[PDB]
Amino acid sequence: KVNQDGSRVLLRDVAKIELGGENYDIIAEFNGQPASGLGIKLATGANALD
Amino acid sequence: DVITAIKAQNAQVAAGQLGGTPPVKGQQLNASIIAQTRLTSTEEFGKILL
Amino acid sequence: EDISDYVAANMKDAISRTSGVGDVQLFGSQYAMRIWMNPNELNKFQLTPV
Amino acid sequence: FSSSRWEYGSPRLERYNGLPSMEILGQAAPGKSTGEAMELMEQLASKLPT
């Protein structure tokens, strides 16, 4: 908004804006060291070792 | 006006949680919040204000 | 937060769409433009999260 | 309330496997074929920007 004054209101003011993390539920520690992993789950009747 | 007031009263809404995903370091309790819930009987539907 | 974003924005897409993968449960989450509202700096300008 | 500007843009953007990728079509040579025509092309891309 703009008020009846001239003073401008923009997101920056009303809210803190940081980039990253769409959800904060799961975090991983590789030997205590912060890390992310790729956990692949198998299909049904696939080809394993291949 | 009958329809519009029906879905306004007979509603199931998903609200947030006490002590959510990004927390304050030292948060003790984590609980889900229930706001409105779906009306279950003929009496509760009779009490829908217009 | 920085790693789990990168592993999704460089690696995950190539996995989930390859050799007979059922589903890839990645460890973390990719970035999102998070808008962390403040109710007081929000009340001050007669504004709402809406 | 509007501004009028001329600006360059692509009429045909193309993507290979979820990543932005432009295609180049070529030949073998009147002498050599594929096995070397592809081989020299392999590191013409390897000897340029990261």
Q: Is C14 on the interface with D (CB under 8 A)?
A: yes
Partners of residue C32 in chain A, C-beta under 8 Å: 20-22
First to last CA, chain A: 59
Do the Cβ atoms of A18 and C22 come within 8 Å? no
CA distance D32 to B47: 87
Q: What angle (nearest 5°) sits at the alpha carbon of residue D9, between those of residues D6 and D15? A: 170
Q: Is D2 on the interface with C (CB under 8 A)?
A: no
Work out how many CB contacts closer than 8 A connect A with C.
100
Tokens of D3: 């501004």
Which residues, 6+ apart, have CB-to-CB distance to B7 below 8 Å?
A: none
Burial B1-24 (b: 16+ CB within 10 A, else e): eeeeeeeeeeeeeeeeeeeeeeee
Distance from CA of A40 to the nearest CA of C (A): 5
Contact in structure between C17 and C24 (CB atoms under 8 Å): no
Resolution of the solved structure (Å): 3.6
Distance from CA of B22 to the nearest CA of A (A): 6
Q: What is the DSSP string of D18-45?
A: TEE---------SS--STTTTHHHHTTT
